[PDB]
Amino acid sequence: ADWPRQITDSRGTHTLESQPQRIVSTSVTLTGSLLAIDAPVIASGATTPNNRVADDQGFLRQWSKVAKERKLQRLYIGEPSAEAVAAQMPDLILISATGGDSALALYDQLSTIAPTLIINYDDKSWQSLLTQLGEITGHEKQAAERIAQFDKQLAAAKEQIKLPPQPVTAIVYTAAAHSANLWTPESAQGQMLEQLGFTLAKLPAGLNASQSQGKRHDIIQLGGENLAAGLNGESLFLFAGDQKDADAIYANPLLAHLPAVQNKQVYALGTETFRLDYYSAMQVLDRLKALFLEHH
Ligand SMILES: O=C(N[C@H]1COC(=O)[C@@H](NC(=O)c2cccc(O)c2O)COC(=O)[C@@H](NC(=O)c2cccc(O)c2O)COC1=O)c1cccc(O)c1O
Ligand SMILES: O=C(N[C@H]1COC(=O)[C@@H](NC(=O)c2cccc(O)c2O)COC(=O)[C@@H](NC(=O)c2cccc(O)c2O)COC1=O)c1cccc(O)c1O
Ligand SMILES: [Fe+3]
């Protein structure tokens, strides 16, 4: 039989007696993947409504419409609340290990309400994460279907586009802060670009970020002099940004000497690409096609 089944965490192996039917996600990031495979996620943590990466509820933009259609409940905005979770009467609770949406501090408390699992999204492809969530929820078939849909579009996409100059740097840029976070090869963003045939730029020395003690594997912070130093690719991709962000880079005196700037190879991928799940991955495909189709 399919249930019960054991799922192993960083906190050991746990028993899911039966298929979850009321999943609460304390990670707004994880929620996108849950929705993509039609898992019964009935409530989610949210970030700040109408901020750079979220909709009017604090949900991530790429699955905003889906959450509204399904009447997804919002647990809280920003600060995690164990009582809010309890009130949803979950039979499974998910927590992200890293990121601003991690409710890891409430692990012990949440653990008393329902079986509770800790998931990393900082160190694996969106497909890997989807597959893992499929095992957790009993929606393996759905996860495989979503991945197959993408694989078909990818096979066509790789044929349809001509790559810009390599290697490339992928970031999230914060214009008024004159800073960026640089996506690593391990990050979902990095793995996706590699899958599409891109080579990520190697970093200078002094650039390397501790990821001991379970610290995140997805980004390297670029503040101060590290900004110009870290944007060293021949092309530059801005996730979670659109044209005004690319134009801000093109106009920044601090960055004027960089090759991606001087060769006009700075590309915005969209505000809905802060986190990668099936929905935003498909968007990234479409955008790369719009930018790089041979015939353009
Ligand atoms: O100080 C922290 N945020 C700031 C400052 O961080 C930022 O300026 C940007 N941010 C990254 O570039 C980033 C690139 C790659 C990965 C990132 O996570 C980025 O944050 C944009 O983030 C934001 O727009 C918002 N962001 C989310 O809603 C979010 C939703 C779900 C999950 C999140 O992690 C979110 O940020 C609001 O957050 C913030 O602005 C902060 C500290 C410690 C660890 C954090 O993760 C922080 O975010
Ligand atoms: O680009 C925007 N800002 C700039 C310029 O804003 C600011 O420099 C500061 N901040 C205010 O001055 C502010 C005064 C009055 C009101 C403010 O909201 C201020 O933030 C510091 O904020 C931060 O550095 C970062 N950000 C958070 O960590 C955050 C974490 C939790 C919650 C936050 O709001 C955060 O900003 C990066 O943000 C930016 O630097 C920007 C865009 C879209 C929506 C935004 O909210 C932005 O601020
Ligand atoms: Fe964050």
Q: Is the CB of 52 under 6 A from ligand 1?
A: yes
Alpha carbon nearest to ligand 2 atom 8, residue: 177
Cis check: omega of the bond before 4, within 30 degrees of 0: yes
Distance CA 233, CA 255 (A): 13
Amino acid at 225: E
Rounded Cα distance between 287 and 270, Å, is 8
Alpha-carbon Rg for the chain, nearest whole angstrom, is: 20
Check pocket membership of 28 for ligand 1, CB cut-off 6 A: yes
Ligand at minimal distance from the CA of 190 is 1
How far is the CA of 138 from the CAs of 3, 17, 247, 291, in angstroms? 9, 12, 45, 37
Query: What residues have CB less than 8 Å from 170, skipping those under 6 apart?
Result: 182, 183, 189, 190, 193, 200, 236, 237, 239
- DSSP class of residue 200 equals B
Return the ligand 2 atom nearest residue 179 CA. 40
Question: Do the Cβ atoms of 234 and 166 come closer than 8 Å?
Answer: yes
- Ligand 2 atom at minimum distance from 50 CA: 44
Strand residue runs (E) in 17-167: 23-25, 41-46, 73-77, 92-96, 116-119
- Ligand closest to CA 50: 2
Distance, CA of 184 to chain centre: 12
Q: How many CB atoms lie within 10 A of CB 233?
A: 25
Q: How far apart are CA 208 and CA 206, in angstroms?
A: 6
Residue nearest to atom 2 of ligand 2 (CA): 176
Q: Can you tell me which atom of ligand 2 is nearest the CA of 175? A: 1
What 3-state DSSP class applies to 166? Answer: coil
Specify burial of residue 234 (Cβ count, 10 A radius: 0-12, 13-18, 19+): middle
| 112 touches 3 (CB < 8 A) | no
| Sign of the C-alpha dihedral computed for residues 252, 254, 257 and 259 taken in this order | negative
Q: Which residues contact 237 (CB under 8 A, 6 or more apart)?
A: 168, 169, 170, 171, 193, 267, 269
Q: What is the DSSP letter of 55?
A: -
- Is the CB of 51 inside a 6 Å radius of any atom of ligand 2? yes
Atom nearest to 47 CA in ligand 1 = 28
Q: 48: Cβ below 6 Å to ligand 2?
A: yes
Contact 18, 4 (CB under 8 A): yes
Question: Is beta strand 266-270 parallel, antiparallel or unpaired with respect to 235-239?
Answer: parallel
Whether the CB of 167 sits within 6 Å of ligand 1: no
Phi/psi of residue 31, nearest 5 degrees: -55, -35
For the chain, list the domains and their CATH numbers: 1-119 (3.40.50.1980), 120-296 (3.40.50.1980)
Contact between 236 and 171 (Cβ < 8 Å): yes
